[PDB]
Amino acid sequence: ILGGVNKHSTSIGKIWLTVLFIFRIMILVVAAKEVWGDEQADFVCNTLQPGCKNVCYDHYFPISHIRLWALQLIFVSTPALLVAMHVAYRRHEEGSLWWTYTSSIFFRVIFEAAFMYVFYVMYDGFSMQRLVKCNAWPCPNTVDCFVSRPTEKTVFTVFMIAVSGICILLNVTELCYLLIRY
Amino acid sequence: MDWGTLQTILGGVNKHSTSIGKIWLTVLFIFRIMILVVAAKEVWGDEQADFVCNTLQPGCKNVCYDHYFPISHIRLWALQLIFVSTPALLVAMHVAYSLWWTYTSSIFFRVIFEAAFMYVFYVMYDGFSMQRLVKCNAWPCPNTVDCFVSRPTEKTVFTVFMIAVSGICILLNVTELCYLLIRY
Structure with missing residues (x-):
């Protein structure tokens, strides 16, 4: 499949873009996907209220990191x-393939940029915190909850x-290397 | 989870x-399989393990979960993918093993199955949004019990x-179906 694409x-x-892509898949698959293995099993909150752990985890992690990267890889690979x-198919039956190529790289620069924006606005930077304070219902006034493996x-x-x-x-x-070629 | 020779099957079709x-239906179909396999199937991993109900009654958790989730989402999508792929x-x-009628009828079923399965999602789950809190009063639970879903937002x-x-x-x-219809 890799040889075909x-x-x-x-x-x-042909070289640098496709080695970096396979670079990200290896990081996501063989190493990172089991750092997030117990993201909820080891979430700990200092309270006695039933259901407070479920709502506090869901409020601070609306979507996990490893499933944002899985979605991002699919969108840029399509x-x-x-x-x-x-x-x-069009060959099975210059400007034609020029348009279908300059557009393909135009989508990839958009999907990569869009997903990076979501990370910043959703998680407030790129560093994870040891302690999160949560006050959504049914939790009482304010509860301390502790994240699992924040440093890794x-x-x-x-x-x-x-x-x-x-x-x-x-x-x-x-794109610029191709644009000045006119 | 793994493919032995699955490329050949999709390559033949x-x-x-x-x-x-050739392209868009096949691309969108392999799109849904990837979402279901590599990403979604572990959001629903602990659907019943992390169901939490605020009661001391034995058996209330089993009947309240079964009442609000008669069939899980990931197994509705798994069945839908099988029906439209057949x-x-x-x-x-x-x-x-007349090819006009075989091809035209093949896509007519595909429309029916997809429309049917989308209808089941709406009626049985009351829209496409999932709630943090569910109120359950089936036996043996006492008067009314609060139960909390796991990962409602994801x-x-x-x-x-x-x-x-x-x-x-x-x-x-x-x-x-229109292009084939116009071709007569």
Whole structure:
């Protein structure tokens, strides 16, 4: 599958963009996915009120980090895989394939940028906190809850953000490398 | 979870397809499978393990969970994917065994199954949003008991994501039915 999608790309596009992509999948799969294994099993709150743990966890983690990265990988992997099927049919029966290529890299720079924005606005930066204060119903006045493995989750969050930020620059520079060609 | 030769099956069905059916229907179908497999199937991992009810009555948790979740979301989507994938696979084997009627009827079922399953989601779960609190009063529970769902917000995100994709697959199938209809 990788060999099929590796073709039809420029020097940076054929090599650097596709090694960074497979780089993120390995980090997500073999290492990170079991850091978040017990995100709720080890959430601890200092209270006796039933149901306070369920609402406090759900209020502070509306969607887990590893499932934002899983969604992001799918969205940026689809425009490239869709090009391979689309052009083959059009050839099975310059400007034509030029449009279907400059547009594909235009979607990837959007999906990467959009997902990075969601991380910042939803989680208030890129560092996770040891202690969260929660006051949603049915919890009494204010409750202290403690996160599981805050330090190890920061390391992978920073690592994933930096790699995605590089992929934006690689996509941008290939556009300019192609734009000045006219 | 793992594929042995699953690329070959989708590769074989990739050929022998029309303009829209070859790409967009096949892309959106492999889209839903990935969401169901790699991401969603562990949001629902502890649906009953983290159900919490505010009572001391033995058995109240079992009957209150079963009353509000007669069938889980991830197993409604699993059944839906099987039903809409069978007319396509059946045609491939039946042809490899008048092709107009086999193809046209195949997509007509696909519309019916997707519309039917979306209807079940709405009526049985009362919209596409999941609540933090459920009030239950079935026997043996006393007068009325508060119970709390696990991860209501994340289950709402994937519900909206799956419904939206299914709605697009309906429009793609409908417009294909028009092109074949015009061809007469």
